[PDB]
Amino acid sequence: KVIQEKLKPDHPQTIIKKTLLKEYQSKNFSCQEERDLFLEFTEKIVQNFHNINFNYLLKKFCKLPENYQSLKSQVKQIVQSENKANQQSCENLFNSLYDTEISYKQITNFLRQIIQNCVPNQLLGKKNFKVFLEKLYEFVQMKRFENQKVLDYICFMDVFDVEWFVDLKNQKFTQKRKYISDKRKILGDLIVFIINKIVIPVLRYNFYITEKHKEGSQIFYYRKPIWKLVSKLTIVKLEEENLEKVEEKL
Ligand SMILES: [Br-]
Ligand SMILES: [Br-]
Ligand SMILES: [Br-]
Ligand SMILES: [Br-]
Ligand SMILES: [Br-]
Ligand SMILES: [Br-]
Ligand SMILES: [Br-]
């Protein structure tokens, strides 16, 4: 399975419930019993996301800029309100709003906390789970057109670290390589599930993800309140192009 690319959003709990309702997360389970054990974890994941405190964690790990209120006030006096245009003020504002991006270290700390709090570590196995968390920094900093491969995760993991797999073929204790080949397929699907159905929804719900330049350049993360300001300014600037380019051209 392919890891999806990072580039109003639904709460992760809504997205997770919907994928469990409408989709299957692996074609590689050996039997219904093994599938059911996976589904046990998914029910806990749903409950955890119902109870998680994103805003507290955002305040802790990815705080709004100390100048947020000033930036908010400045944007408000452009939108509400004037009659005429001032592009210099917007050049001063836009650039200052673009300067409020959240560091990758901060994003990764936030993300790792959410995954630790919400994804039971026995889903991947305790040691495998730590490997997964370690790889999230790379995920967070990846530019457009860049991607991780499932092999990037699972090559450093061990199927024998997973406690809940069902060895239907009775190969675990005597035929290691066959067991490993089979169960790596599931482990890989678990990696994809967490990234595509948990990590990406968490990032999209909590941040505006963009590039500072054009496509493929450095990834930038903004707090949603910051981007709501950026949105407000482009609306006014767009409505300026609906008056200056129309009324004067008549
Ligand atoms: Br499933
Ligand atoms: Br905050
Ligand atoms: Br990296
Ligand atoms: Br392995
Ligand atoms: Br377990
Ligand atoms: Br073997
Ligand atoms: Br999503």
Q: Which residue has the tokens 């992760």?
A: 12
Q: How far is the CA of 21 from the centre of ligand 7 (A)?
A: 15
- Quickly list DSSP for 7-45: --PPPHHHHHHHHHHH--S-S--SSHHHHHHHHHHHHHH
- Cα 231 to chain centroid, rounded: 21
Ligand nearest to C-alpha 138: 3
Does domain 1-63+101-223 sit in CATH 1.10.132.70?
A: yes
| β partners of residue 184 | none
CA distance 163 to 105: 32
Q: How far is the CA of 201 from the centre of ligand 7 (A)?
A: 4
| β partners of residue 208 | 222
Residue 44 one-letter amino acid? K
Burial status of residue 21 (CB atoms within 10 A of its CB: 0-12, 13-18, 19 or more): exposed
Q: What CATH number is given for 64-100+224-250 in this structure?
A: 1.10.10.1970
Residues 6+ apart with CB under 8 A from 42: 16, 20, 25
Q: Where in the chain is the domain with CATH 1.10.10.1970?
A: 64-100+224-250
207, 224 Cβ separation under 8 angstroms:
yes
The alpha helices in the chain, defined as continuous H runs, are 12-22, 32-51, 54-61, 68-79, 87-97, 104-118, 126-141, 150-154, 176-194, 200-206, 224-240
The sign of the torsion formed by the CA atoms of 236, 238, 240, 242 equals negative
16, 10 Cβ separation under 8 angstroms:
no
43, 17 Cβ separation under 8 angstroms:
no
Burial status of residue 32 (CB atoms within 10 A of its CB: 0-12, 13-18, 19 or more): exposed
Query: Tokens in use for 7?
Result: 């580039």
From residue 118, how far is each of 38, 54, 141 by CA, in Å?
A: 15, 11, 22
Query: Tokens in use for 48?
Result: 């955890």
Q: How far is the CA of 108 from the centre of ligand 5 (A)?
A: 26
Ligand nearest to C-alpha 41: 5
Q: How far is the CA of 34 from the centre of ligand 1 (A)?
A: 10
Q: How far is the CA of 140 from the centre of ligand 3 (A)?
A: 8
CA distance 130 to 157: 10
Q: Where in the chain is the domain with CATH 1.10.132.70?
A: 1-63+101-223
Q: How far is the CA of 65 from the centre of ligand 2 (A)?
A: 8
Q: How far is the CA of 29 from the centre of ligand 6 (A)?
A: 20
- Quickly list DSSP for 224-240: HHHHHHHHHHHHHHHHH
Query: Tokens in use for 5?
Result: 């690319």
Expressed in Å, this structure's resolution amounts to 1.7
